[PDB]
């Protein structure tokens, strides 16, 4: 299919929710593309509302482990883990289409007090981890991201570039 022909130009897609299932397909394509040529860029096209934190992290670590630069491009939208992955592209190679939208927010959800505390702590660790990493991606202070993800934060393309979350808006 045409999607294979997009893969020959080193385009990887993430469309829809981030699941273990969609994530590992992205991970597998990245590894294949490095195998085909570890010195040529990869272009990761993202249109996603978010999804699984761990599934997104598996893509994330793969982007950082492989040799090729992973360029990211937002078309339509990149929200939650989708915005996270967008922001994780090679600095200088993060793009958005003019009418794409970006959204970032703190983690969200859907026993015994001991069990609820354990999961509350894990949820706060994930929150702090995501805020720290996004501060690194955006070249900002952790205080910015803690304040700016407290609730759903919608950003236009021009605002995402201003924030440090992407580098360039494609105009033609």
């Amino acid at each position: 299919d045409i999607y294979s022909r997009l893969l020959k130009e080193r385009i990887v897609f993430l469309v829809g929710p981030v699941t273990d299932e969609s994530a590992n397909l992205v991970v597998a394509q990245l590894l294949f593309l490095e195998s085909e040529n570890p010195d040529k860029d990869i272009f990761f096209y993202i249109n996603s509302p978010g999804g699984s934190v761990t599934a997104g992290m598996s893509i994330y670590d793969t982007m950082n482990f492989i040799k090729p630069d992973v360029s990211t491009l937002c078309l339509g939208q990149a929200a939650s883990m989708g915005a996270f992955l967008l922001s994780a592209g090679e600095k200088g190679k993060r793009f958005a289409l003019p009418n794409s939208r970006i959204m970032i927010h703190q983690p969200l959800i859907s026993g015994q007090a001991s069990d609820i505390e354990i999961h509350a702590r894990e949820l706060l660790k994930i929150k702090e981890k995501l805020n720290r990493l996004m501060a690194k991606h955006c070249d900002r202070d952790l205080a910015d991201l803690e304040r700016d993800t407290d609730r759903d934060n919608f950003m236009s393309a021009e605002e995402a570039k201003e924030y440090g979350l992407i580098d360039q808006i494609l105009e033609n």
């Binding site: 130009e9 385009i11 272009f43 096209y45 491009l73 190679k93 793009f95 289409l97």
Partner: peptide, 6 residues
């Protein structure tokens, strides 16, 4: 989406 992505 080229130029430049790719």
């Amino acid at each position: 989406f080229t130029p430049x992505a790719p």
